[PDB]
Each structure stands twice: as C-alpha cells, then as structure tokens.
C-alpha cells in the first residue's frame, strides 16, 4: 500500500522517498538513525500527545455543564476553573534565557510577513521581501487615492507618480529630517568628509543626526544610492536621473527602497491546505528550497554591497530571516500511520521534518549560508492550550534536536497566545520555554473562535464585528505585551501582533496597524510583501523600543477582565441585523470552504457582504462557523435560517468565481463543499474546541477521492 516499514511507522513512500533523496543529503545525518528516530519520537510523545488532547476535551465538558447549571459570578466562575486546573498559580518573576539568536528577532523591531509554504512564488517574494519599493507600494494601492487625474491606468499616470513621489518625500523628512529645509526641494546627493550633504536650491544640509547616513553606492561624489537608517530599519534611496520616475525628480530620484520584512514565516498551518502526504511534500520541498537558497519559479536576493560613511565596504542582509510553522498538536496525518492503522499526530511530524530540514539553512548552498548566522532554527508552535502543552512542545523539540544531532535549544521557539487557555496561564507557558522562546504573538483570530467555543454554553456571543472591541480581547491584548517584558522580552525576543486581513484596504492598514507597535510589539503580521513595506513606515514613525521601556513593570489586564465572556445583550438585535450576521457568515465560510475543499486553497480573498475583500483562513472559518454555531445552539436563528442563508450565498459564491471552478448549486446536497461548509455550522458546536480541521481534512479528503475517479 505504498507505505514503508520502519519500526512500528508505516511512511507513505513520497514522503519516504523525499526525505531520504532530497532532505537528509547534506545534514550528515545517518538516514537509519533518523528514521529510527522518528518511530522512537513518535512512540515515546503520542501517549502525552493524546492525554493533552483529552484534557481539553474534559476541561471543556466541565465548563459546559457548569454554565448549563448556571449575572454570571465571575468569583464563583474563576475559582471553579481554579479547582479543575484550567487556571493555575501563576510562577514567581523570572528572565528568559534563550541565546543565539539573530538580531532580526531580539533587536530589529518591523514587519514579519506570513505567507502559504505551499505555493513557490509567494514564499519566494517573501523571503525577498526583506527589501521592497516604497514608490510601487504607493503607487499600486489605495494609499495613494485615485482622485481625479490620480486615478491608475494601463500606463504611468505621472499625477499619480507626483503623489507618489510627495507621499515618500514627506516620509523622509519625517524619518531622517534634514538639518535644515525639506528632501521635497533635494536637487542632489553626494559624500564629504565622510558626510552626507543634501544639495537645496538656495545651499546645502546635512542630516539632523549625522548617525542616521549608514552608507551609500557609487562614486562618493555622485552616489547611485545613499543608504539611512532610522530606528534600526533601513531606508534607501535610489539615485538614477536616467531612469523614468528620475528624469522627472527634482533630484533625479528613481525610488525609495524600505527594509519591510524583516523576519518571516513559512506556514504549514491555517494559511494552507496540506491532508496527506502529497501536501505535506510540496510544502515540505518548498521549505527546503528556501533553506538551501535554491528555490526558483525568479530566485532569492543576495545580500547587498554598501560603502560605509568612511569609504570601505559592507554588506546587509538580502533576505527576510525565516521561521517556519509548524501545526499544533490536534491533528494527525496518514502520511504515516502505525501499524494498526492509525494516523500519526502531525505536529510531531512537522517537527522532525521541518526541523531536518531547517538544518540546510545552517550552512553555505553553493552561496553563503541562506538563514540563521547565530545557529538558531525557529518554530512557530501555533494553538496551544495552557504550560503543560508549551512543556510538551519544548520537550518535543528536546527530543528532535537528539535525532537532528544539533545542540540543545538549537530549535527555538514562537509561541502564538491564540487560545484561551495559554492566554490566563501566559506567564507559565513562557516559563515552560524560557530557554527557547522567540516571540510570543496575540493570534487574536483563533483567540476569538476559542474564546467564542469555551463559552458556547453560557449563551448567545456578540456579532463577529463586536468581538475587536470587546473587554475581553482588550485586556488579552495588553496581558501578552505585560507578560512578555516582564519576561525581559526586550532585547531579547519579539512581541508580536496579529493580522492585517482587508489586502486591499491600504490606506485603512496605513492609519490603523500603527497601533499595534504604539501597544509596544516589536513585530506584527502582514498578509504580503507590499503589506510589509507600507507596514514598515509604521516602525520608523514609533519608537517600539522606547514604549517597550516605558511600559515596563506595568500590569495592565485582571484575570477578570480577561475572563469577560462576550455574552450578548438581550434583545441586541433586530431581524434585519441578526440576517444580516447569517448572511455574511454563511458567504464568507462558503467563499473560503469552496476553494479549500475543492481546490485545496487555504488562504482567499472572499469579498465579504459588504463587498471587502478579506482574506480568510482557518482561523476566520472558525470565527464565522463557531458564532453560528453558538446562535443556533441558543435559538437566535432556527435550522431553516441557517439552511436558507447557505443555499441563498452558495449562488453568490459560485458567481464570485467562474476558474478551475465547481458550482455548489443548484445541487447542494450532492457539493460536497457545501456539505462542508454545512457541517462547519451545524456541528460547530461539537468540535473539539471549535477547530475546523477535523471537518476540512475530512471533505478535501473526500473530494480528492471523488476527483480521482
Ligand atoms: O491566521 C493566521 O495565522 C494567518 C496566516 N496568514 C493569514 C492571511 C489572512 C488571514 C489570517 C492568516
Ligand atoms: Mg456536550
Ligand atoms: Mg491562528
């Protein structure tokens, strides 16, 4: 059955076959030792794997019926989660400790991208998204409004690229201000005396802070670049009169360059569509691509050549640093089973595997070494509920490090708080990886649809809408920033925010995401490369290492405010809202189920009901599917609202489409999307901790079986 023996594992031959032919060459592993490794990882982990699993399960069930058995007493609530162990005491103050870890993650605060490992060119343009064009991020988007005469076309439209040009001098004079006058009236650059002087029409300036030059290409005289630095991010500005956009600049000014992406992340998780074993490869492969610097559909940047203020040379790095994620520790995946046929837990899979072959970008690709300089692996360990699983994943990692032969806490570790679980214990969940931990970051996407399936019993939940402005979310959000400094993050480890979803509301993610490094996070997620260079302007607008500091010692978020469940009001609705709600739920999760089951997308852009373009995941399906859910289970839809809306939006689906594309109607009971996107809903409220994957995996399954005959 195409499978291979080793021990008690039974390893589908593709991925058999990939890891001996293109993942062990080169790591100086012995291939029977790491198979050997394997089936004793997977022995020795699977019975805590399970028993974790089954906690929760429990924990939930006695959370059920004691809101079934219920002005809810927030005293009588916490001291019963207190008494099964949900919430436990809370470790006296302590450091972490982990060491080895490139400056990119400890010190260097900006953007960290996220992008599906499964498809080739979007990982490509991640990793070199380390570098993007301030002017194509303008000009491309709606930062730049396309009022009259501004407006985009099949070709340049030099109002617009004035705007553009205006929008980037502004930005200049605001992250390196010249000591006198503005860049918007530079006519020319050059190096003396190893000084930047900036040619006005009238004289001539220098930087308000000389420290800011940090270098330029070219003759000195006449650069073809200078090179500035401002809160430790990049800023280059490209000099070329003979180009286009330079003929018409005051100062022969092609671009501005911006170090957007500074870290990124690999997703094997909700960003992708992996069930099997000939999923699980394609990511794999492409995740070795990126680490041996050979992945090409276009190919990866090289670092950049500079000469230092003083005259000799120096080199930046080319590319985004790259983390990987792995999934966490729910699912299993029968690209190995044991010998009774069960699946293999998933989690400890990518481990092993993501981990060998992080090993590659360690290490020169004939070509410098591609990624970690300092000798680190980073993991991001996504839903985890509460210590003892952060302990299971250290352990994890503990064990696989042996296998790898790398030295201990080589495989470091960020950890996502995005269930509520990890959220009250945070503090212990760090102390339970204070040798190993990167980052902590609020996935405040998941953290909604666990917060929404914790308190599935204790009524009807606020709309989806509501939920962003909720107590509840408010306080987790500051709580993790809390935790993390008081942690000592600062230096030493990133605090990171959530996901910017509407991609093509720019100019809302401009005046909106500079929030997030204003709450002090040293990093925050963006959906793209051109997403991570307008998200940049944000790091050199706020001082993230200043408010870091002043906001140290502070503790800012009650375990009661965090445990603030999001009941709605009665009578908070009237007929028209509560469709409206149904409406866009039922659309969105059809938008996104539909391409995921039928095509094995698990990342879209779904226009939601009021027509913007969201990009959806797992983590968004969850939400949708989970407050659905919650209604019907309280009676504020019936079974028949919830079947009318499905079959209402289904043909709005399929005329959103019409690709590779399978219509879901007329006929739903025979789509298996639709049954799907169905099932999502009406056995919400029966998933373990709401999760849509059990459901996923099971119909993309089945329409891969379907397709196949
Ligand atoms: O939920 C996550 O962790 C996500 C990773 N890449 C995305 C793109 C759009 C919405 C959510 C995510
Ligand atoms: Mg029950
Ligand atoms: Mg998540």
């Keep these: 059955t195409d499978r291979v023996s080793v021990g008690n594992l039974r390893i589908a031959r593709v991925l058999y076959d990939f890891v001996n032919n293109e993942a062990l060459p080169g790591t100086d592993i012995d291939p029977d030792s790491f198979w050997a490794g394997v089936d004793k990882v997977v022995a020795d982990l699977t019975p805590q794997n399970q028993a974790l699993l089954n906690a929760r399960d429990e924990l939930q069930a006695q959370i059920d019926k004691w809101h079934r058995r219920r002005p809810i007493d927030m005293d009588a609530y916490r001291q019963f989660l207190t008494e099964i162990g949900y919430l436990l005491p809370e470790p006296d103050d302590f450091t972490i400790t982990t060491s080895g870890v490139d400056a990119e993650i400890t010190t260097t605060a900006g953007p960290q991208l996220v992008v599906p490992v499964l498809n080739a060119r979007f990982a490509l343009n991640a990793a070199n998204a380390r570098w993007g064009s301030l002017y194509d991020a303008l000009y491309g988007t ?71 030059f940090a270098g330029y290409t070219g003759a000195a005289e006449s650069p073809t670049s200078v090179l500035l630095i401002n809160h430790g991010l990049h800023i280059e500005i490209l000099i070329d009169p003979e180009s286009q956009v330079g003929t018409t600049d005051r100062a022969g000014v092609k671009d501005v360059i911006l170090e957007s992406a500074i870290t990124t992340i690999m997703d094997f998780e909700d960003s992708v569509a992996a069930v099997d074993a000939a999923d699980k490869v394609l990511g794999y492969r492409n995740w070795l691509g990126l680490n041996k610097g050979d992945l090409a ?147 405040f996407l998941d953290r909604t649809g666990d917060e929404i399936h914790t308190s599935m019993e204790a009524g009807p939940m606020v709309r989806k809408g509501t939920m962003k402005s909720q107590p509840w979310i408010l306080a987790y959000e500051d709580h993790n920033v809390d935790a993390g400094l008081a942690a000592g993050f600062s230096g030493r480890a990133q605090v990171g925010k959530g996901m910017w979803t509407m991609t093509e509301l720019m100019a809302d993610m401009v005046e909106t995401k500079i929030a997030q490094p204003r709450a002090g996070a040293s990093t925050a997620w963006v959906p793209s490369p051109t997403a991570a260079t307008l998200h940049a302007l944000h790091y050199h607008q706020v001082d993230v290492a200043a408010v870091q500091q002043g906001l140290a010692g502070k503790r800012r978020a009650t375990i009661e405010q965090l445990l ?18 149904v409406d866009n739920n039922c659309q969105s999760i059809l938008g996104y189920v539909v391409r995921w089951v039928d095509q094995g997308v698990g990342a879209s852009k779904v226009p939601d009901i ?17 407050l659905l859910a919650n209604w019907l289970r309280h009676g504020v839809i019936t079974s028949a609202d919830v079947r009318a809306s499905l079959e209402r939006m289904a043909p709005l689906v399929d005329r959103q489409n019409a690709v590779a594309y399978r219509p879901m109607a007329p006929n739903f009971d025979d789509s298996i999307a639709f049954l799907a996107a169905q099932e999502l809903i009406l056995s919400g409220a029966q998933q373990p901790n709401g999760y849509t994957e059990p459901i996923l995996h099971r119909r993309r399954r089945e329409f891969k079986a379907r397709a196949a005959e």
């Excluded at 060998?356 to 839903?383: C, E, F, M, Q, W």
């Excluded at 699983?389 to 042996?402: G, I, K, N, P, Q």
């Excluded at 214990?425 to 190993?436: E, S």
């Excluded at 009021?610 to 989970?626: C, F, W």
């Design 142 to 212: 709606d930062v730049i409004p396309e009022t009259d005469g501004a407006e985009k076309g099949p070709t340049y439209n030099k109002v617009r690229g004035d705007k553009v040009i205006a929008y980037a001098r502004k930005f200049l004079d605001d992250s390196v201000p010249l000591s006198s006058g503005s860049f918007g009236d530079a006519t020319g650059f050059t190096v003396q005396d190893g000084q930047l002087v900036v040619a006005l029409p009238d004289k001539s300036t220098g930087l308000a802070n000389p420290g800011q």
């Design 297 to 443: 559909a276009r190919v990866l940047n090289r670092d950049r050549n500079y000469t230092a203020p003083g005259g000799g040379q120096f080199t930046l790095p080319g590319r985004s640093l790259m983390f990987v994620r792995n999934v966490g520790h729910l699912m299993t995946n029968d690209a190995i089973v044991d010998t009774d046929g069960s699946e293999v837990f998933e989690g400890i899979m990518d481990a092993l595997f993501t981990g060998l072959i992080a090993i590659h970008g360690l290490k020169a690709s004939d070509g410098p070494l591609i990624n970690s300089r300092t000798g680190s692996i980073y993991i991001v360990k996504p839903k985890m509920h509460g210590p003892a699983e952060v302990a299971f994943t250290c352990e994890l990692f503990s064990r696989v490090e042996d296998v790898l032969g790398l030295p201990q806490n080589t495989m470091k570790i960020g950890i996502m708080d995005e269930e509520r679980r990890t959220t009250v214990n945070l503090k212990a969940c760090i102390k339970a990886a204070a040798d190993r931990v990167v980052f902590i970051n609020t996935g």
């Design 564 to 581: 603030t469940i999001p009941l709605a009001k009665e009578l908070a609705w009237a007929p028209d809202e509560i469709r409206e709600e």
């Design 610 to 626: 009021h027509d913007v373009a969201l990009m959806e995941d797992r983590a968004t399906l969850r939400i949708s599917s989970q």
